[PDB]
C-alpha cells in the first residue's frame, strides 16, 4: 500500500515545518528595523544597446564586467561592448526560438538554448576569426529555460521536462541529472563557489542541489505560482526567487526558511528576472509591467524604479564589480543603468 | 574623433555587424511565420504534406512568399511558459478533425484548445486559420452516427452541408475578440490540393489588414 507511504510523507513534512518554525524566533524585518534605510536610488540609462530586432529573452554579463551577451528571438546572439556600445560578435543561431544565454567565466564560450531543447555552446576565442558551434547538448525533452557555466567544460542547464542536468562539454553527455521537480524548471543560479545551485520551477518550489553529489539538499516552498527567476545572495548562504504572484521572497540556506517577502499592492504582475547587486543590499527585480523595481533587500521597503522600457523587462543582471545593471526587454533594447 | 586606431576599427566592425543585422532582418520581415496548433494530431501532419526535437519548422513557398509553419506538438510542457514566444506570429493554423466528433470527447478537446489559444492574452490580434480537415471521413460517419453525440443542442438533420456549417459556426462562436481578430475556415482533406492557395489568400488578408491597421487607415 503506497498510501502508507503517502501517510508517512505527510507526517514527515510536518517535521519539516515544525523544525522550521523552531528556528523562526525573529524575522529579518525585526533585526533590520533598527538600521538606516537606503533612501532613494536614482539610476540613469547610461547606454541603450540597439541592434536586436525581436524580443530580447536573456542576457548575461561576462566576468570582466564589460562584455555582455544577449539573446533575442530574431535568431541572433549579440555580444556587446557595454562601455563603448559596439557589437563584438553577432552569432546567428540554428534555432530562432532561444530563451536563455550564458557567458562563460573564462570568456571563451557562450551557450544558448531554447525551444529546440538543445544547449549550443559557441566558441568565441577560436582561430579563423569566426564564432562556431563547439558543441550541441541534446538530452533534454523540454524547452531549455536556463544554462549556466561552471567552467569551460561543465554547464548546468534546466529544462521544461522537470529536470536540471549537469553536462560535460567535450564528451557532450549528461554527467549528472537533477530530478525532483514536478514542474518546468524556469531558472537556476549557481552559488559563488559553484558547488551548489538553486533551481526554481513551476511547482512553486525552489530546490538546492549539490553539484558533485547530485542530490536535492533542501526544498523551499513559499510561493503560490510559477517561480520564473532565482538568484543567489553574494554571500552564497541565501537566495531570492521571483514568481508570477508578484512577490520576490528571500530564502536562506542555513535556517532553511524564507526571510523577507518583497511585495507591493501596486504590483500585480509577475517577476521575470531577479538579481542582487554587489553586497546584496539591493534586490533588482524585473516585472511584466515594463518596469524594474529596486528593493532594499535587508528591509522590505522599495527603493527606486528602473523605468524606461516600452515592453516587459525579460532579463536583468548586475555586473561582477556591481557597477551597472543591464536590463533587456521585449522591445529590442538593452539599457544599462548605473 | 578621440578614438584610437583600433577603437575606430572596432566601431567599423560594429557598423558592419549592424549592416548584416538589417539585411537579415529585412529578409525575415518579408517571411510569413505561421503557428500550427492542431489538437491531439487531428490532421495536423496531413496538411504539412499538402504544403509543397522541440518544434518542427516547415518552410514552403507559394507565389514568391516564404512561409514557416512552427509545429509545437512535440513540446508536452506547460504551454503558458513558452506561448509568448510566438506572440507576433502572422496567423495560427488550427487543425480540427471533423471525424473525431464521435470519439472526454475528442472534439470537445479541440474546442478547449481552440478556446484557450484564440482567446489567449498573446493572440488577441493574430488571426486563426481554421482547417476542418478529414471531411471525406465525415461523410461515412454522419450518415450513420449523427452530430447529437458531440453536440446535443443541434436540431438540424444529418445533411453534411448543414452539419459542417454547424461545426464551423460552433468553432467560430468561440472568439470573444471579434473586433480585432478574424477566423478563416476551410473544409479540406488529403485529396484537397487548393489548401496552400487558401493559406496564401488567408494570410494576405491578414497582412493587408495589418498594414492598413499600422498605416492608420483602420
Amino acid at each position, epitope marked *: 500500500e503506497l498510501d502508507q507511504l503517502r501517510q508517512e510523507a505527510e507526517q514527515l513534512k510536518n517535521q519539516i515545518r515544525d523544525a522550521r518554525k523552531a528556528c523562526a524566533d525573529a524575522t529579518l524585518s525585526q533585526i533590520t528595523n533598527n538600521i538606516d534605510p537606503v533612501g532613494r536610488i536614482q539610476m540613469r540609462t547610461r547606454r541603450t544597446l540597439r541592434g536586436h530586432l525581436a524580443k530580447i529573452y536573456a542576457m548575461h554579463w561576462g566576468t570582466d564586467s564589460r562584455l555582455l551577451v544577449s539573446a533575442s528571438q530574431d535568431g541572433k546572439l549579440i555580444i556587446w561592448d557595454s562601455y563603448t556600445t559596439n557589437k563584438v560578435h553577432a552569432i546567428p543561431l540554428r534555432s530562432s526560438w532561444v530563451m536563455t544565454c550564458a557567458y562563460a567565466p573564462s570568456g571563451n564560450y557562450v551557450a544558448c538554448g531554447g525551444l529546440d531543447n538543445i544547449c549550443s555552446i559557441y566558441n568565441l576565442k577560436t582561430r579563423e576569426g569566426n564564432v562556431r558551434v563547439s558543441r550541441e547538448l541534446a538530452g533534454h525533452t523540454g524547452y531549455l529555460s536556463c544554462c549556466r557555466f561552471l567552467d569551460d567544460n561543465q554547464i548546468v542547464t534546466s529544462s521544461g521536462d522537470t529536470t536540471c542536468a549537469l553536462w560535460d562539454i567535450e564528451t557532450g553527455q549528461q554527467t549528472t541529472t537533477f530530478t525532483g521537480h514536478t514542474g518546468d524548471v524556469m531558472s537556476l543560479s549557481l552559488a559563488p563557489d559553484t558547488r551548489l545551485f538553486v533551481s526554481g520551477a513551476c511547482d512553486a518550489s525552489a530546490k538546492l542541489w549539490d553539484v558533485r553529489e547530485g542530490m536535492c539538499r533542501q526544498t523551499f516552498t513559499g510561493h503560490e505560482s510559477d517561480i520564473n527567476a532565482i538568484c543567489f545572495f553574494p554571500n552564497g548562504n541565501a537566495f531570492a526567487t521571483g514568481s508570477d504572484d508578484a512577490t520576490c521572497r528571500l530564502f536562506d540556506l542555513r535556517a532553511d526558511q524564507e526571510l523577507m517577502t518583497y511585495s507591493h499592492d501596486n504590483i500585480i504582475c509577475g517577476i521575470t528576472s531577479v538579481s542582487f547587486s554587489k553586497s546584496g543590499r539591493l534586490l533588482l527585480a524585473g516585472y511584466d509591467d515594463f518596469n524594474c523595481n529596486v528593493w532594499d533587500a535587508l528591509k522590505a521597503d522599495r527603493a527606486g524604479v528602473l523605468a524606461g522600457h516600452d515592453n516587459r523587462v525579460s532579463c536583468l543582471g548586475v555586473t561582477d564589480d556591481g557597477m551597472a545593471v543591464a536590463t533587456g526587454s521585449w522591445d529590442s533594447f538593452l539599457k544599462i543603468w548605473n | 574623433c578621440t578614438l584610437s586606431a583600433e577603437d575606430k576599427a572596432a566601431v567599423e566592425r560594429s557598423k*558592419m555587424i549592424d549592416r548584416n543585422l538589417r539585411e537579415d532582418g529585412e529578409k525575415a520581415a518579408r517571411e510569413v511565420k505561421l503557428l500550427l496548433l492542431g489538437a491531439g494530431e487531428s490532421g495536423k501532419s496531413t496538411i504539412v504534406k499538402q504544403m509543397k526535437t522541440g518544434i518542427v519548422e516547415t518552410h514552403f513557398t507559394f507565389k514568391d512568399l516564404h512561409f514557416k509553419m512552427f509545429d509545437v506538438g512535440g513540446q508536452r510542457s506547460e504551454r503558458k511558459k513558452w506561448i509568448h514566444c510566438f506572440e507576433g506570429v502572422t496567423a495560427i493554423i488550427f487543425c480540427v478533425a471533423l471525424s473525431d466528433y464521435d470519439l472526454m470527447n475528442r472534439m470537445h478537446e479541440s474546442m478547449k484548445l481552440f478556446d484557450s489559444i484564440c482567446n489567449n492574452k498573446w493572440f488577441t490580434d493574430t488571426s486563426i486559420i481554421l482547417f476542418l480537415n478529414k471531411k471525406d471521413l465525415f461523410e461515412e460517419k454522419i450518415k450513420k452516427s449523427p452530430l447529437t453525440i458531440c453536440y446535443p443542442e443541434y436540431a438540424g438533420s444529418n445533411t453534411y452541408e448543414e452539419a459542417a456549417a454547424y461545426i464551423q459556426c460552433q468553432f467560430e462562436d468561440l472568439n470573444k475578440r471579434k473586433d480585432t481578430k478574424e477566423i478563416y475556415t476551410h473544409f479540406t482533406c488529403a485529396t484537397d490540393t487548393k489548401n496552400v492557395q487558401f493559406v496564401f489568400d488567408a494570410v494576405t488578408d491578414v497582412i493587408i489588414k495589418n498594414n492598413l491597421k499600422d498605416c492608420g487607415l483602420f
Partner: single-chain antibody
Amino acid sequence: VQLVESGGGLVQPGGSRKLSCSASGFAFSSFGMHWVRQAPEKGLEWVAYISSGSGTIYYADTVKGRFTISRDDPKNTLFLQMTSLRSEDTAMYYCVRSIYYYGSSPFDFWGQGTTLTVSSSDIVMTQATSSVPVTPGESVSISCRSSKSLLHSNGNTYLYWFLQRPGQSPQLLIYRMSNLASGVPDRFSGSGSGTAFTLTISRLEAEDVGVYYCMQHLEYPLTFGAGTKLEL
C-alpha cells in the same frame, strides 16, 4: 589558417607589378588586412591597410598615391597594385591579417611574403640595442622606447611585440602591452610605462633566437622599431 602571397620577381624601375595574397583556412572577409614590407637588410615597415568590407584604406607616406590595396572577398584574395616602382621598394612584402574588436589580437598571423626586386607627426619607435649576445637559459630584457605616449584615454597601450625568427615571417608575441598572444610560451612577458617599454624573456630557449620588433598601433602610419637581434 595560412596566408600565401604571389607576385614578386625582377621588375624594371618605374614599372608596375601586382601582388596577390591568397587567403585560406580562415574567415577572410571579417579581417582587416595589412601589407608590411621588409627591405633585405632593414627592419619591418608598414605599407598599406584595407579594413573588413573595404571601408577604410590607409597607406604609408612613402607609397601614397602610387600603391593601391584592394581585397576580393569571394575569392579570399588580397591585392596590392603597385605602380611606378622605385629602388626603395625592393623588399619582402608580408600580408598580415588583423581583426579589431574588444579583446582581439591584431597582427596575429603573417603571410610568408614575396620578395619583389627592382633593378638598378609619425611616432618614432626606437630600439637602441641592435644586437644582443645571449646564452640559453638566461633572462633577456629587450627594451623599446617610443616618441609619444602610446597609452590612450581608454586605458589601452597600443604596443605590439613581434619575433621574426631567421628564415621566417614575423610572429606576434605581445599584442597590447602586457598581453600574451595565443600559442606563444609563458616565458615571454611585456611591460611598459606609457613611453618606455620592455619585453622580458624569462628562461630563453633555442627557439627565441631572432629579431624582436616593437610596433605601435596608436595611429596610422603604424611604425616599427629597427629590431634587436638576439644571437647565441
